[PDB]
Each structure stands twice: as structure tokens, then as C-alpha cells.
Design a protein around this ligand. Structure first.
Ligand SMILES: COc1cc(N2CCC(N3CCN(C)CC3)CC2)ccc1Nc1ncc(Cl)c(Nc2ccccc2S(=O)(=O)C(C)C)n1
Length: 268
């Protein structure tokens, strides 16, 4: 039973539900004056004891970010029980569904998607922002007039600013960087690790660390042994394998920055 604020209903016509989850509801909505379509993300704040709700972080970060490979924030409205975000609607849906539908991608296609993602990451890191939740489900597929596709990064819910090492253990096990799991302190490059895992999935359809018991999974990540198994990876270029390898280094100082990803021949 969402209490939609007057200011939102005044300018937008709320539409159909396009997604639903444990913390947010996302709806299609239409701006009355222009008929332009947008997404309305409704974030349910956590209720505590007494008449109060927990404060949220997403908007503090979203307010700062403006980039073509990032879902644009149009407007925000905070009420005691939930938070309202009007955001650009990306009609092609998200990358999780695309991957299940398409299975795997060509190198020309995957590199273009990685080029997109690393651009977003380079930008965020230039602002000292770590996303900490980069994975296909948080990536949206923009479909161009020319038939081409581009990625847009959304959902800044776990995002924060890096000023010295961070320690909060968070994320999705498949995509989570070893230093996060090691609890020795982490920073911006956890996003590169995530991008590496995504690129790996794009070329073969399965993740590099699949585990067995969530114990085997975490050990695999900490050890970082990246394989490119036959026959799945036989027709994939050495250039692609080299780049993914550099993104998935346990040694944080050796692991590529986003700039280094964009400068690699495979993405150019
Ligand atoms: C209309 O465009 C979209 C369609 C879908 N899918 C959702 C799943 C659905 N399938 C149908 C078939 N089923 C077999 C599986 C489900 C198809 C349409 C997903 C996302 C979008 N576009 C979109 N644009 C901006 C935002 Cl802002 C957002 N946000 C957004 C939308 C949905 C969920 C979460 C977020 S999110 O904002 O929390 C973030 C993860 C991007 N979603």
C-alpha cells in the first residue's frame, strides 16, 4: 500500500509494473505534459520499532552521477515510508534476461558491451565512487535506432565513496572480489573484478567460479584460478583471454584499472 506523493501524481501518470523485488517496485510511468516515458522506482524503506524508517543511501550517490552509460536520474521524492525515483526508461530490459535468451555473445558484441561498462566504471572511479554491485541484473540494454545495443548501469544501492579502505562484506557471490571475501580491505577495483566475471560469462555462457556449499565458491574466488576450458573457449581469441585474466587478478595492484581496460586492444 504505497502512499504515492502528490507531487509525483501531479506531473506523472503511473503505469504498469515492469519489475518487482524484495526492496523496490519499478513501474512504467508517463509525464503528462510531454507523454514521454520514464521509470518510477519505488524503494521501500525498512521499518524499525516505533514509528520510524531507516534512511537510504542510493540518492546521495545518484545525485552526483551523470554519464551516458549510466541510467539517468530525473527526479527524486523522499517520504517517511518509501523513496521515489523517476528515472530514464530503458526499453531493452536488463542483461540478465538478455544472456538467458541469447546464451552467449560474439567477441565483437561482448567487447562493445565491456567498452560501455568500463566507460561507466572509469567515470565512477574518477569520482571516487565504487559501485560494488556490478552484475548483469543491474545492467540495462538500450537498443539503438541503428539496431546496435548499449549497456546502461543502474541500481546504485550498495554504491559508496572510497576514501581509504572499505571493509563491508557485500555483493553477489558469483561477482564478488576476493579482497571483499578476505576482509583485508578493498577499494575501487572490485568493480573491475566484477566486469571481468561478466565478460567471461558473455563469451561462454557460464561464470569462471561456479563452486559446488558456499565454501567451495569462496575458496575458488580467493585462489582466483581462471580457466578457459575446451571446447567452450577454443574459438575465442588470445586477446580476449588475456584481458579477462588481467581483470581477474588476485593482486589488486596488478589488476587493471578501468582506464587500462579501455586501452586494451580487444575493446578498441
Ligand atoms: C520496460 O523496460 C524494462 C523491462 C524489464 N524487464 C523486466 C523483466 C521482465 N521479464 C519478463 C519475462 N520473464 C520471463 C522474466 C521477467 C521483462 C521486462 C526490465 C527493465 C526495463 N527497463 C528499465 N529501465 C529503467 C529502470 Cl530504472 C529499470 N529498473 C528496473 C526494472 C525492473 C527491475 C529492477 C529495476 S532496477 O531499477 O531495480 C535495476 C536493477 C535496473 N528498468
Amino acid at each position: 500500500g504505497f502512499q504515492i506523493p502528490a507531487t509525483i501524481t501531479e506531473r506523472y501518470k503511473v503505469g504498469r509494473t515492469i519489475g518487482d523485488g524484495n526492496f523496490a517496485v519499478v513501474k512504467e510511468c508517463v509525464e503528462r505534459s510531454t507523454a514521454r516515458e520514464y521509470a518510477l522506482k519505488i524503494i521501500k524503506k525498512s521499518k524499525c520499532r516505533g514509528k520510524e524508517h531507516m534512511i537510504q543511501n542510493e540518492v546521495s550517490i545518484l545525485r552526483r552521477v551523470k554519464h551516458p552509460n549510466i541510467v539517468l536520474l530525473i527526479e527524486e521524492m523522499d517520504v517517511p515510508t518509501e523513496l521515489y525515483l523517476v528515472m530514464e526508461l530503458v526499453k531493452g530490459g536488463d542483461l540478465f534476461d538478455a544472456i538467458t535468451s541469447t546464451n552467449k555473445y560474439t567477441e565483437r558484441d561482448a567487447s562493445g558491451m565491456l567498452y560501455n561498462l568500463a566507460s561507466a566504471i572509469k567515470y565512477l572511479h574518477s569520482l571516487n565512487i565504487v559501485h560494488r554491485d556490478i552484475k548483469p541484473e543491474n545492467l540495462l540494454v538500450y537498443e539503438h535506432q541503428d539496431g546496435s545495443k548499449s549497456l546502461k548501469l543502474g541500481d546504485f544501492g550498495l554504491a559508496t565513496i572510497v576514501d581509504g579502505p572499505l571493509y563491508t562484506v557485500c555483493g553477489t557471490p558469483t561477482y564478488v572480489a576476493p579482497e571483499i571475501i578476505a576482509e583485508t580491505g578493498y577499494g575501487l577495483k572490485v568493480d573491475i573484478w566484477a566486469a571481468g566475471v561478466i565478460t567471461y560469462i558473455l563469451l561462454c555462457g557460464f561464470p569462471p567460479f561456479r563452486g559446488s556449499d558456499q565454501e567451495v565458491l569462496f575458496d575458488q574466488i580467493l585462489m582466483g584460478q581462471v580457466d578457459f576450458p575446451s571446447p567452450y573457449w577454443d574459438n575465442v581469441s588470445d586477446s580476449a583471454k588475456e584481458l579477462i585474466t588481467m581483470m581477474l587478478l588476485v593482486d589488486v595492484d596488478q589488476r587493471f584499472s578501468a582506464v587500462q581496460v579501455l586501452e586494451h586492444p580487444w575493446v578498441n
